[model samples]
Target: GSMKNYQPNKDLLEILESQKIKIKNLKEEVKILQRKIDQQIAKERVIKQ
Candidate 1:
């Protein structure tokens, strides 16, 4: 009588795991682009050259 372990949506779990990984990579790229934009703005504001 050991029926404690059950996976009803195993397939959904697998898909979510892959989707999370994809988003993680995309998030990193977004952060990098954001930083570059911020740096460019800061330099232009201060130097105005």
Candidate 2:
């Protein structure tokens, strides 16, 4: 025997969704930074050579 019904908590669900969006935005920023860093390193290597 158990409780016949269970309900999801709305506040927690909203928080989870917002966190996902935040993570997605941060990942894009990191990706852009990585590309710029790689470009800078390449340019520096060619200049030193």
Candidate 3:
């Protein structure tokens, strides 16, 4: 009789995949927020000029 190899948990793999996607989205959101903040600061500087 041949023995079957042990498989890892499918649920953990799914959770990891979802977390990766969430991190990618968060990174994009942070970039956009930073750009908006920079633009606002530049506008303030222009007003002072």
Which numbered prediction scores highest in TM-score against the true structure?
A: 2
lDDT of 1 at 41: 57
Indicate whether candidate 1 or candidate 2 has the larger TM-score: 2
Which sections of candidate 1 miss by over 4 Å? Answer: 1-19, 33-49
Q: What is the lDDT of candidate 2?
A: 0.64
Candidate 3 lDDT, tens digit per residue, 1-49?
A: 8954334545765788787887877777787777787687544543331
lDDT of 2 by residue, 1-49 (tens): 8744234455766888787887878778887767787687544543331
Quote model 3's TM-score: 0.24
RMSD of 1: 18.4
Best-to-worst ranking by TM-score: 2, 1, 3
Give the range where candidate 3 is weakest over 10 consecutive residues by summed lDDT. 40-49
How close to the true structure is residue 19 of candidate 2, measured as C-alpha lDDT?
Answer: 71
How many clashes show up per model? 0, 0, 0
Please, what is the whole-model Cα lDDT of each candidate in the order they appear? 0.64, 0.64, 0.64
Question: How do the residues 1-49 of candidate 1 rate in per-residue lDDT, one tens digit apiece?
Answer: 7734333455766888677987878788887777787687544544321
